[PDB]
Amino acid sequence: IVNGEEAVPGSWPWQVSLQDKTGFHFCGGSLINENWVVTAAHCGVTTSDVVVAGEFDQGSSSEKIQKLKIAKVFKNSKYNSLTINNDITLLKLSTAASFSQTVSAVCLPSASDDFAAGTTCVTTGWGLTRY
Amino acid sequence: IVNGEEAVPGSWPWQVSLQDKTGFHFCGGSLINENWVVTAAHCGVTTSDVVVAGEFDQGSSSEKIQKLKIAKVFKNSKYNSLTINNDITLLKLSTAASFSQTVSAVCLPSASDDFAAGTTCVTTGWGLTRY
Amino acid sequence: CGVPAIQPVL
Amino acid sequence: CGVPAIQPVL
Amino acid sequence: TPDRLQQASLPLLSNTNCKKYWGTKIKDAMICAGASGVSSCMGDSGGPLVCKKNGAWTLVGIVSWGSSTCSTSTPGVYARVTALVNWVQQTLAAN
Amino acid sequence: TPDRLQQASLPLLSNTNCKKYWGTKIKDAMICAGASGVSSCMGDSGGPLVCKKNGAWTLVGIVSWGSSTCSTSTPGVYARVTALVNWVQQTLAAN
Numbered sequence: 001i002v003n004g005e006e007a008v009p010g011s012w013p014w015q016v017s018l019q020d021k022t023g024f025h026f027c028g029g030s031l032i033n034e035n036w037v038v039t040a041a042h043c044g045v046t047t048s049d050v051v052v053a054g055e056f057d058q059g060s061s062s063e064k065i066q067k068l069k070i071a072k073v074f075k076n077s078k079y080n081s082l083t084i085n086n087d088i089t090l091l092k093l094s095t096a097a098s099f100s101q102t103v104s105a106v107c108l109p110s111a112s113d114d115f116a117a118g119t120t121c122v123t124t125g126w127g128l129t130r131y
Numbered sequence: 132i133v134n135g136e137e138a139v140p141g142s143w144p145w146q147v148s149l150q151d152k153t154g155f156h157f158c159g160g161s162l163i164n165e166n167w168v169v170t171a172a173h174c175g176v177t178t179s180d181v182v183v184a185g186e187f188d189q190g191s192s193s194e195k196i197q198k199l200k201i202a203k204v205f206k207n208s209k210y211n212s213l214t215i216n217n218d219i220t221l222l223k224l225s226t227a228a229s230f231s232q233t234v235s236a237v238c239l240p241s242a243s244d245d246f247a248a249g250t251t252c253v254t255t256g257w258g259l260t261r262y
Numbered sequence: 263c264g265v266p267a268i269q270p271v272l
Numbered sequence: 273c274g275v276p277a278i279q280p281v282l
Numbered sequence: 283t284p285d286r287l288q289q290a291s292l293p294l295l296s297n298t299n300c301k302k303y304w305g306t307k308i309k310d311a312m313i314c315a316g317a318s319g320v321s322s323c324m325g326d327s328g329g330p331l332v333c334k335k336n337g338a339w340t341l342v343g344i345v346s347w348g349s350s351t352c353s354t355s356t357p358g359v360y361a362r363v364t365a366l367v368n369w370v371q372q373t374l375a376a377n
Numbered sequence: 378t379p380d381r382l383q384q385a386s387l388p389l390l391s392n393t394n395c396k397k398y399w400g401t402k403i404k405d406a407m408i409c410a411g412a413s414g415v416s417s418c419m420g421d422s423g424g425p426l427v428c429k430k431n432g433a434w435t436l437v438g439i440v441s442w443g444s445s446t447c448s449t450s451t452p453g454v455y456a457r458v459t460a461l462v463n464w465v466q467q468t469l470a471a472n
Contacts, residue, residue, distance in 0.1 A: 002321040002352045004290035011270035014263075014339075015287065018328060025283065026212035028329030030341060033263075036374065039328025040344050040361060043212075044175030046204045046220075059285035073177045074373050076366060078311075081157035081174075082259065082378070082419040084359075085309040087346045088366045089177075090373050100267075106332065107264035107340040108367045115342050115364070117296040121315060121333035122270070123345060123358075124289040127326030128213065131352040133416040133447045135385035142280035145273075145434075146382065149423060156378065159424030161436060164273075167469065170423025171439050171456060190380035205468050207461060209406075213283070213324040215454075216404040218441045219461045221468050231277075237427065238274035238435040239462045246437050246459070248391040252410060252428035253280070254440060254453075255384040258421030262447040264338025272291060274433025282386060350445075 001127050009056045010102035012124045016068075017052045018045055025058055028125040029091060030106045034099055037068075037091035041079040045070065045091060053103045058126055066103060069094040132258050140187045141233035143255045147199075148183045149176055156189055159256040160222060161237045165230055168199075168222035172210040176201065176222060184234045189257055197234060200225040283325045290320035294333070294342075295357055303356055304348075311365040313343050314357040322360075323352035331360050341367075378420045385415035389428070389437075390452055398451055399443075406460040408438050409452040417455075418447035426455050436462075 016037050018027040029039030029051060037051050047070040055065045074090035097103055115121070147168050149158040160170030160182060168182050178201040186196045205221035228234055246252070292315045300314040308314065315331060316322065322329075322345045331343035344361030363370075387410045395409040403409065410426060411417065417424075417440045426438035439456030458465075 001288040004288035007287040007289040008271045010268040022208045030330045043328040057286040077153045105263040107338045109340045119294045123331045125326040125329040127323040129284045132383040135383035138382040138384040139281045141278040161425045174423040188381040236273040238433045240435045250389045254426045256421040256424040258418040260379045
């Protein structure tokens with residue numbers, strides 16, 4: 001996010017972070033409930049990867065974060081690599097998230113749901129802040 | 132490959148193709164032996180994906196191709212998503228390839244191996260041929 | 263879902 | 273390894 | 283990348299005004315946002331785009347792609363949850 | 378994409394003459410090639426870059442990335458097998 005500000009600690013309870021066995025954050029995901037995560041297909045998540053929830057400051061060791069394991073990765077099959085169209089994979093968690101004041105679910109809309117141009121929304125994450 | 136020509140049928144025996152359960156080719160890989168494939172980390176191969184070897188014309192049904200299943204995906208952990216640095220994952224095959232006149236292994240070099248600028252090499256695949 | 267315990271600040 | 277049965281044509 | 287979580291508000295555009303930018307790369311299962319002085323960037327991917335719908339934050343998109351330079355002028359391209367909730371809806375039943 | 382397999386010969390460049398193009402995106406585990414009138418493109422990824430070394434074709438690189446437009450002028454960027462064979466060498470032993 002180039003040009004964002006720091007979030008309030010635990011104010012986006014559905015945000016998870018995908019890190020490799022190295023502990024390198026490379027993608028973000030979203031909790032749809034305490035067993036499944038939603039992130040992008042292009043992320044290329046494997047099951048040797050771990051989901052992390054309850055995190056805020058990726059660099060603090062005194063934070064009660066939850067390191068969840070990947071059971072199976074579900075790549076939408078309509079996903080188009082050449083286009084990056086239908087870029088949605090689902091993550092099936094081997095070990096159930098424990099919801100709390102900082103770990104919760106995001107709401108999915110109806111295929112029917114409408115969200116019109118010029119509507120203000122919000123996007124969070126730990127992407128580069130400068131290019 | 133924009134600006135290449137058609138290959139001789141079975142003249143690149145180590146070339147495999149990664150296709151989703153839909154049968155959509157989205158990446159290429161290379162046979163290092165009859166149990167392991169090598170492709171790119173960014174490809175994002177899952178085990179619901181299948182490796183295909185012995186193929187030439189992706190559109191012919193009379194071709195004796197071998198559809199191999201993915202056992203486990205090995206993403207180099209030095210792989211950097213943000214950079215696409217160390218973009219090498221290994222593919223462990225559930226079901227051993229059967230080498231033949233059209234299915235074989237490619238040679239890997241020594242970390243020591245040298246390959247100097249201006250040296251002519253070759254690159255094959257089924258990528259877009261026009262942009 | 264979608265309604266946090268710690269209300270986000272904009 | 274690296275030496276095909278069907279020699280590639282350039 | 284930054285150590286702690288960032289956030290940024292940003293306006294959703296129509297796909298059309300988007301085609302303006304990405305032209306024929308924008309597909310029906312993609313929805314744009316940004317070009318407001320904020321920009322999603324490397325490491326953002328897979329992440330959330332929420333909008334407030336009747337009290338709750340709803341998964342309106344997935345940080346997918348855009349500018350190589352993370353230009354606060356090009357709008358970013360997100361996954362369009364609305365055209366994919368049906369598959370989600372379905373993978374869960376299944377498993 | 379095409380139905381049957383394509384191939385193209387192309388010259389390897391030094392990383393430096395490459396930095397010329399991609400600048401500081403080229404890392405030590407990446408090696409360039411192309412900018413000859415041929416270009417690797419969408420769907421090529423994961424695939425082979427071989428060079429003939431003493432009779433046999435050797436895995437010299439992995440089709441990784443480059444031009445968005447697949448410009449036969451920008452060189453493509455491949456994985457540099459030489460800096461990664463040691464990890465390969467090792468994953469196999471292990472499994």
